[PDB]
Structure formats: C-alpha cells, structure tokens
Amino acid sequence: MIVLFVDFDYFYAQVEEVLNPSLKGKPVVVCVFSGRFEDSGAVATANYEARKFGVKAGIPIVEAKKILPNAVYLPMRKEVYQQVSSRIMNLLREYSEKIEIASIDEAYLDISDKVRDYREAYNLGLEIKNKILEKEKITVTVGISKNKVFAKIAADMAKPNGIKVIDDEEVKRLIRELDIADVPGIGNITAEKLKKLGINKLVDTLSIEFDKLKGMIGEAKAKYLISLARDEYNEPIRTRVRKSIGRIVTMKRNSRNLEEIKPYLFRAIEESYYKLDKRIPKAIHVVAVTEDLDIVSRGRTFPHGISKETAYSESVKLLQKILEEDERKIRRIGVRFSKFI
DNA sequence: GGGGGAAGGATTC
DNA sequence: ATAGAATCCTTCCCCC
Ligand SMILES: Nc1nc2c(ncn2[C@H]2C[C@H](O)[C@@H](COP(=O)(O)NP(=O)(O)OP(=O)(O)O)O2)c(=O)[nH]1
Ligand SMILES: [Mg+2]
Ligand SMILES: [Mg+2]
C-alpha cells in the first residue's frame, strides 16, 4: 500500500497572502480576537517569517505583540479559508477516488491503484505540488509511506514546501529512533506518561508488558502504538462523514446569571443551524467552558429531528442543568449538534 | 460477560 | 495568559 499525505503550509496565513501578495515576506500572524478587551484572544497561525521569533498558535495575542509589535495582525476569516480549501481538495479527487479529508489543511490519498513504487509516488507528488500552485497559488507539503501515520510523519519533517518518502526500512529505522511524542496522536498528556515508563521510541512498546501500557494511556492508544511497533498498522483511506457541527462563543463578562448567557447561547444556535443547512440533527449538546478553563457539557438525544424552535427550547434546560450542578462562573458558552439524518 | 448510550479527557487543528 | 472546531476514546451507569 502507498499513502499520499498533503499538509498545506501555514494554510491560514498563506491564503491571506494569496489574497494580498504585498504581505509575502513580512511576518503575518492571524488572530482570534475574543472581544472581552482589546487584543484579547489567541493566535490561530503565523507564517514561517513570524514563526522564527516564536509567534505560533496557542500563545495569546498580547504575547505575540511583545515579540513582534509591528507584524501584520489580521482577523481570522475561516469562511474564506474554507472556500480556498475545498477548491484545492476538488483538485485532489482527480488523483484517487479513495481520499480522506483529515482537516482543513490535510488530506490522505490512497494511490496504490494508481502507482506501485515510491519513485512514481514521488513523481506524482510534485505534479500535485504544482497543479495546486498552478491554479490556487498555494504551496503544500506532501508525504508518502506505507500507511496514514508515516505519510503524516514524512510531511512533518518535509514541510514547508516539502516532499518526502519514508521507505519500509526507514520505517524500521524510525520505530527505533523516533521520539514517541512525535507520533501522530500522542500529545503532551500521554507523551509524559510514556517517559514515566521509559518509552522514548515506538519499539519500547513491545519490551514492556501490556496492562502496564493499557492502564496508563488507554486500550485503543495501546493497541495503536503496539500495531505500529510491529509494522502491522493496517488502516485505510475512507470518506470522512462530518459527524458533528457546533459553535461556541466567549462572553465579555464571566457570569452564571441565566438571562446573561441566553444571548450568547441563542447566537450560538443561529450560527450552528446555518452551518447545518439541510442537515437535521437528532442530538444537541450544550458545551460550556468554566472561568477556570475546564470543559463541562450536557446533552440529550431525540428519536426525531430538531427544528430551531426545539433547539432554542432544549438548550436552556441543558444550560439550566449545568448551572444546577456546578458553582463556577461560565466563560465560554456554546452548543453542538450530532446524529444527523 | 458484554451491548449501548450520555458526560470528561485528550489530540490537533 | 488562557480561541475555535471536531474527532476519537475512557469511564460510569442502565440493560440483556
Ligand atoms: N482557531 C484555531 N485554529 C487553529 C489552531 N491551530 C491550528 N489552527 C488552524 C489554522 C492552521 O493554519 C490550520 C492548519 O494547522 P496546522 O497543520 O497544525 N499548522 P499549519 O499548516 O497552519 O502550518 P504548519 O503546518 O507550518 O505549522 O489549522 C488553533 O489553535 N486555533
Ligand atoms: Mg498545514
Ligand atoms: Mg494540520
């Protein structure tokens, strides 16, 4: 099997430059203004010119300005970045019927019925990397290996504007030399938990016995890293059906008074039902972030569809149930819809 | 013993 | 100081 991976380079900032080529070369940093005061929020992404001085996703907009107070700070236009992303995807379907859209800047191509050697897979790559540059003027980074994981890891080192093939005996090489936090699916919570058991590379998952591994990171994670250690990561490319749609907004004031959170909640449903459009959910969840950044939610499943009048009605009792069972101020309110028809 | 949901956790975008 | 969005997974609990 041969898997082809596509990670658009700093996709949000790149699109802003395609629409305003003057920015090309300057530190661009796209922001998520929360609104509670001036320059409150997070950085969604920053182009590599701004990445150098440590302007990355996650750090608040304040810190991103003590570092580069003269960079170009633009508000995120996710609706514009989506329209550009779909046009790029609709050019990738021209290379395989079996394609998986992972995220907005990510896609796997199963091209085993279109090539059969990493050399022709490599030669397919640039004809991707340039058809995209030909029609949408965006650079991408492609990775190719024997499964969806190492194709991911390939692009993880090749980016930006990169191309990389990880052959089946570098796969053997990596299992023994790859820091395991750099395995896709292992964030900081579980990376630390692995060091605590002396697991630095993927091979150490077989030297240790199983239930020591399961009880700390979980059964699916354990059976996941275990299958990659023995070079037995199956896993194909299948169309991803969007199973959830929602929106969650941040209040200008921390509060728990219900008639203060009703406006933000009702505005979260108006946008969510627009994002739905012809999709009827059977379940609504009321997500809420606390004043201490914790995450609590209450939901319900209906045997039928939910019309905006029924979502307006349900979301207030789920909201009541939250405040019923916790004493903390609410910082972010939202809603989320699943179980579509 | 195990199927099958509704609420916190963790990854990544 | 600490966005938004969505996926999968674990854990507790009702049910054969
Ligand atoms: N709202 C929001 N959006 C984010 C966040 N993180 C990423 N995104 C959105 C905006 C990101 O541009 C888009 C893709 O994210 P990546 O693949 O993780 N990084 P990119 O491809 O951008 O650059 P490079 O690969 O060179 O780091 O996901 C975030 O924390 N918040
Ligand atoms: Mg990318
Ligand atoms: Mg990505």
From TrEMBL:
What cofactor does this chain's UniProt record say it requires? Mg(2+)
| Location of this chain's protein in the cell | Cytoplasm
Which residues are annotated as active site? 106
As its record notes, the protein acts as a catalyst of: DNA(n) + a 2'-deoxyribonucleoside 5'-triphosphate = DNA(n+1) + diphosphate
The entry's free-text remark on the cofactor is: Binds 2 magnesium ions per subunit.
Per its UniProt entry, which superkingdom is the organism in? Archaea
Q: Which residues bind Mg(2+)?
A: 7, 105
Subunit record text: Monomer.
Family recorded in the similarity comment: Belongs to the DNA polymerase type-Y family.
Give the PANTHER family listed for this entry: DNA POLYMERASE KAPPA, DNA REPAIR POLYMERASE UMUC / TRANSFERASE FAMILY MEMBER
Please state what the protein is called: DNA polymerase IV
> Coding gene?
dbh
